[PDB]
Write an enzyme that holds these catalytic residues in place. Structure first.
Site, PDB file in Angstrom:
ATOM      1  N   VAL G  49       0.831  -1.206   0.000  1.00  0.00           N
ATOM      2  CA  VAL G  49       0.000   0.000   0.000  1.00  0.00           C
ATOM      3  C   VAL G  49       0.865   1.256   0.000  1.00  0.00           C
ATOM      4  O   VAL G  49       0.585   2.220  -0.731  1.00  0.00           O
ATOM      5  CB  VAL G  49      -0.974   0.001   1.196  1.00  0.00           C
ATOM      6  CG1 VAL G  49      -1.692   1.338   1.289  1.00  0.00           C
ATOM      7  CG2 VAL G  49      -1.959  -1.149   1.107  1.00  0.00           C
ATOM      8  N   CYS G  50       1.925   1.268   0.813  1.00  0.00           N
ATOM      9  CA  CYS G  50       2.723   2.477   1.021  1.00  0.00           C
ATOM     10  C   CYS G  50       3.226   3.114  -0.270  1.00  0.00           C
ATOM     11  O   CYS G  50       3.092   4.349  -0.410  1.00  0.00           O
ATOM     12  CB  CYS G  50       3.897   2.130   1.957  1.00  0.00           C
ATOM     13  SG  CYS G  50       3.376   1.262   3.479  1.00  0.00           S
ATOM     14  N   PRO G  51       3.853   2.394  -1.205  1.00  0.00           N
ATOM     15  CA  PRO G  51       4.252   3.062  -2.458  1.00  0.00           C
ATOM     16  C   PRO G  51       3.065   3.722  -3.138  1.00  0.00           C
ATOM     17  O   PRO G  51       3.182   4.840  -3.651  1.00  0.00           O
ATOM     18  CB  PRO G  51       4.851   1.937  -3.315  1.00  0.00           C
ATOM     19  CG  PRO G  51       4.239   0.657  -2.775  1.00  0.00           C
ATOM     20  CD  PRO G  51       4.058   0.937  -1.262  1.00  0.00           C
TER      21      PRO G  51
END
Lengths: 197, 197, 197, 197, 197, 197, 197, 197, 197, 197
Positions: G49-51
């Site tokens: 999710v972070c990217p």
């Protein structure tokens, strides 16, 4: 075991409303600087031993005053109850006209400070305290409630304390004015012992 | 009011080596259950008021024992000092033969437990305690060092407490054998108050 | 294990009433600045090992004073008991006239501060302390009650501490005046080791 | 008076590695039940007073063993250093062959338990402790570092404690085998006092 | 886990009596300002791995001194034991003449401050500490007792820390004088990585 | 000496997600019971000394495994960063394929428990820890950040602890396979000391 | 429930090393005085999710900057890991070139201060914080790990807080630029309520 | 992050009197087992943003219910005040009829348990909480008072959390129904990353 | 709100000696289970406002008893003082024969437990407490000393609480018997509000 | 029993937003210096006893104002709820137009300081408080929830306290304007007692 009354130390300070001469008045320990004070606690106004102690001290009040000693009585009752009791006849268990102050210890501060509060009942034991003119406590007498104190012995003790203060000799068992005293050193004390044994 | 010494509670227990009839024996408060006890502390062997109190109580020990009351004297001195003082003639400030036990409180536990230790000198004040035959403390008398106590008043007090114990009346100020007592309820007390006023 | 007596540190300060030449006098450690002090505690006046120790030190007291060392005896007994003991003939277990002060430790502060109080009896063990003219504790000896000390060993120890103080050599086991000492460094000490072995 | 060292109580237990007849062995206090023990601390192997004390005790160890008393020396140095010192000739400041155990107190636990650790240097004072066959501590001797102890006096004290143990009489100042003792009660001690004064 | 030795922070101060060239001398960390210091602890004089480590460092001491690094050994033994050990021939397990100071940690403060005291035995673990010329700890090595350290690795580390100090490049694993270093930024580090992979 | 890391005591327990052969797997200290472990911490993935130490240990991993010793690397970076770094070519400063686990200490618990967390940056110092097959910590090595460790010295120390574990002899300074050891008692050690000096 | 982020109070101060335009730079909250700040935490570099959140915010960064709002991303990963991820193609899960700072919270101070640390894993939850130009926290959004945030909703909230800041009206549910607002007093809100219902 | 509200842990239990279809009814978190819950606090009945949020959620309540999600509004106002506001026309700032429960938090226990009480006014911040069918808190949104929340964003997050619950993939930034998700492992995530970049 | 006096909770228990029909009797709160109790405190016997309240409640006692409510007065004075006040004619400020118990709070426990003790004087404020047949405190009224209470209001309150107890309706402001009450729910309360407005 | 309301001491200060003449305004105790204040708490807006109390005090508000006394109502409801209730017809259970300030105690600080918060429900008991022009609390009245207070009695009490304030006589039970008061001293009170009995 409780309180601040320590022999040889400043007597616990106190301030209270008292009935004096049938009226209300403030009474402080500092008012008695330079005089001996007999401060006697009793449990409850309108009871049984208590009137007899208050009346006997009141009757003898002037004997103490001649020696420069003031007698003060105190209980946890209010000054209003004290006065009601004064205004009650002695034949009916009252105090009648009184010659000593009756202090009200309604906050219980005096009884606590002198260590005589019977906590389970909220009333003072029959505690009597002798305080000299420098404010130092010299004598503690506390009776359980069913037995009255002795005005004669209180007077003897005041006399003895004043005599030792004034002359530096010490008072034997049972000393009364006129009895022999002892010079408190090893050699001079033999004047007393050779005579009395 | 004295360390653990509280009127109306069990008197602090004690156990001590004593001189009894010129010999050493252990003495315990529990030895006196069922009898009254007058326990009197004094500051120092080989001093001045103290011999006069010990001798006076010794001379009258039998009067107390005729009442079922045992008299015990106590100081911080050891039993060897006590005995040396008993072996000193009265004319030279000694005790001579004694008719009461002399307890040695060398650990100071007794003086501390009764609240009479003059801590800055390590000696006991002139504290006298009256304990009933149930072991309950009834009376506290404590004198500063220069003034001796009264054996008569000790006797009066024991007589008074025994009288209230047995009859359930209370003893007015100055009561002695032969004096009237008060029935401690409002109605029955009137018999006393009308008679004596 | 108790108290404040630490070798190499200022000795616990003390101040006490003492019997000195049959009179009462305040004695305090600071009176001895610049002198050695041998302070010896004993358990009880009018007992058995104690008088032999007090008399032996009294008899050798001048042997210590020639070295600038003052011997002081102390027990928890009062100065009045000390004096009665001094006025008791030695043939009867007394001390007779003494050439050292006898300090009264009635508050037990000296015995507590020096760690020698036998708490379950309230008496001092046979503790002996050697204090130098700088006020520093140099030696502690404490015997159980049934065995007296040696005056000869106390004197030897004072001599040895004074010698090492002045010369900076150290005193072997058993050293007495006249005996060889050791220069306490690795090279110079070989003079002693190669000579005595 | 030392850490946990209290006269009249069980001696602080100890367990240490020791050099015994040139070999390592564990030594513990419980090994000496039924025997007296003289435990002496010293500050440092390869120093100056210490060898003279260890040698003196070792030379006289059979005089203690004939009395049922075991001598044990101890310092904070390790058993390896002790063995090195035993292997050093006495003429060079060594110990040579020894007849007493030398304990290693590398953890400083013994020194701390006996109250003899000099904390600013981490070495023991010259403390000597006499423990009886029941493991009770009877005697404490601690010297400052520059002054050696006396083996004669240690032996005398051991002899004294054993004599009072076995006969229940007490040893006066300076007692030695063959000297008179005192029966410790007021009447029987008069035999001693009258004969010796 | 114990102590105050923290990499990147001022090394714990120390002050000790040491044997230096067969004589006693105070050594303090502050003496070494501007020089690297290798401080190695070992457990006990007159044991087994310890002499091989001391001798190995003493033999290579001039390799460190040429770098401006001073090597200091330390154990809990005293300077008198150290000297005795130095005076023992290497063939007999001794040290012989030493080219490095040997510090005495008799109070155990150094060992406690560097967190290397083995508490259950009172001896230091085989702890080695590299301190830079600003007095900041750069490296901790600590071995269990049965395994000696490597003088080669200690030299390598001193050389690496001086190299990074001076050139601000960093030393890869196993760096030795003459090996490639890394420029510690992302882009310039590829000079190293591209060459060696 | 590190946080909870105490030589001679069970190594602080650990569990972590690791990258093992390019996949994520749980690694726990209890997985290596019965095997030696070399646990090395490094500060940061994608930096400069770190890859050189990781690659060096990876390259030698089979030399350690042939001794029954397992090598584990750890930093505070996550397993996803570890894996990305393994997927980065060594020419670019990456790790390339790895032959050892790389543990992710994202909670910093491992670094804290081992006493190597550089708190002002949140990264581990270059701490290396040798744990035996009983789970007992044997060796602590910690470098400041600029200087890499030596895999050769790590291997030598593993070899030496295993050698002393199995044979009960101790390893002198700089010992390697093939080198003499010492029998750690006074008498048998002479074999080594006389051969080597 | 943890940390110091309180709506309506100054946002917790922060300072961190960041990657900015492919280089390392210190970023601190005080640099943004007078600007809005969207500070968003994410758990781990090189995850999933972070990217997508970082790229979304970076792609929209100019939309926020037109409004005087600066977007900052932060995780616990170091700046070296951040840069490695920026240098990874987006097609392989990388970030590619970024138009927002990525802060490295390697000490976890920022995550702890903002109360978003998932302590059991050592990583930040998906917490996003809107700070106004006076440094006051206006909005808190925190998602569990598997669900990304909405850049559009963060943009709407920034616009809404700015609009209320400037006009002293309040923004109804679902407000966007162009929508009506409410005059927040009883009388004047009727303009809104009557119009929209 | 909210008093007791912790993402990933059971949401703080709550029980409250509520207005439900114009009658009073107790509502508790346990009523909603197996259903998502959107619990939204607002500050005060009869204010300005609050009715637009309440009305917006009420209008969309069936939207959330077709997803198995129950919406609940809550403020510190009593149920009697809630009912008066429901019985107030929307054109006048009232809520009109409602399709969601309105909980009364007059003890402020809910607001304190969810960490949304603005202490200096006694009212809740605009906190919204998403609780899943297993009772676990998944999402926290808190706005300062002048800016309303977004019903569309709340619905988006409910859908997103249910999608990750069901399918075990994760939702990228800005995910809505119809958007791709990511398989949360390094290898399967490449499908998403290569397809969207 | 009074010491331990909390509305809606069991009234503080009490036990006291009281004057009941000219004689002493124990009064306890348990005596009144199933009846209402009006407990009124006053500050001092033989004062001014107090007799007017006691007489006013005494005169109205049967009005209360007809409703099953018992009126109890209390002050810190003893039962002996109470009886003396009762035996004093009202014309002189006495109470005369009383129809209500007068409790003695000599320990102040009642005044403390009900939170009405005026600490700096040791007397009770004019506190009145209404206790229902279940022992639950329903009403607290406390006046400053110069202002007496209203017996009419006390009766009105007892009637009001009794009415609401029986009929489950609630009493408006100024309710007296015969006045309308209110059904305490939203719908049924309209009956009252439409009728009366 | 909770809070700070103490008769005869300064009333707990208070500050609060109130509805005054249909608008919002700050009210604080200091505004009323020189005036009496009747502060009455009630549990909830839009309930049943409360409006009848508020209307009764509002209707009679000028009766108090004429006497220099200001009546103030307070509940935990916000000022927006108060205004809505004021805008609700009295026939509907509303307050209609109001002649007294209604204070909002949304933080519950007033109810806690006056000790009237029913903590289990979060609402005030029916506590009424009379405060004099000097700010001193004179009267406390607290009713359980189902029984309203009496405005007649509140006014009588204000009148009584004002009267004793100005003349220094005391108000007997039931005193209303024009009734006889008592001179508070023993002799002068006889005028009242002889007149009225």
């Amino acid at each position: 075991a409780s309180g601040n009354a320590r022999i040889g130390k400043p007597a616990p300070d106190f301030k209270a409303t008292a009935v004096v001469d049938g009226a209300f008045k403030e009474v402080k320990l500092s008012d008695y600087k330079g005089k001996y004070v007999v401060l006697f606690f009793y449990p409850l106004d309108f009871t049984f031993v208590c009137p007899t102690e208050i009346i006997a001290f009141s009757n003898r009040a002037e004997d103490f005053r001649k020696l420069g000693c003031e007698v003060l009585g105190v209980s946890v009752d209010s000054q209003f109850t004290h006065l009601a009791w004064i205004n009650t006849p002695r034949k009916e268990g009252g105090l009648g006209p009184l010659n000593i102050p009756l202090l009200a210890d309604v906050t219980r501060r005096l009884s606590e400070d002198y260590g005589v509060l019977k906590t389970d009942e909220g009333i003072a034991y029959r505690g009597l305290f002798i305080i000299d003119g420098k404010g130092v406590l010299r004598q503690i007498t506390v009776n359980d409630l069913p037995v009255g104190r002795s005005v004669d012995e209180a007077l003897r003790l005041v006399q003895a304390f004043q005599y030792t203060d004034e002359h530096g000799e010490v008072c034997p068992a049972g000393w009364k004015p006129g009895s022999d005293t002892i010079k408190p050193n090893v050699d001079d004390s033999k004047e007393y012992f050779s005579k009395h044994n």
